[PDB]
Amino acid sequence: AREVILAVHGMTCSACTNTINTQLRALKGVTKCDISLVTNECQVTYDNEVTADSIKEIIEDCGFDCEILRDS
C-alpha cells in the first residue's frame, strides 16, 4: 500500500470526515485512511486497485471541494 494525501475543503463537522473516510475505505484498494480536522486534509493508505482521481471524485460527490496534493 501507497499513501495519497489530498486537501479536503468544505468539511466543518465530524459527520463529514466520517462520511469521507467511510466512502474511501469502501472503494477497493483503500486499506486504511487517517483523516484529521486540523489542516483539512485526508490521508488514504491505498493500493494499486484504487485511483487518486477517483478518490477526489468520490469526495467531490460526497459534497466537498478537494484537491490531490501528493501521492506520498
Are 66 and 59 a contacting pair, CB within 8 Å? yes
Tell me the CA end-to-end span of the chain in Å, nearest whole number: 11
User: Which method was it determined by?
Assistant: NMR
- Helix 52-62 to helix 14-26 angle, to the nearest 10 degrees? 140
Residue 16 marked as a ligand binder: yes
Largest CA distance in the chain: 30
Write the DSSP assignment of 8-60 as a string of letters. E-S--SHHHHHHHHHHHHHSSS--EE--BTTTTEEEEEE-TTS-HHHHHHHHH
Topology (CATH) of 1-72: Alpha-Beta Plaits (3.30.70)
Residue 60, all three cell numbers: 467531490
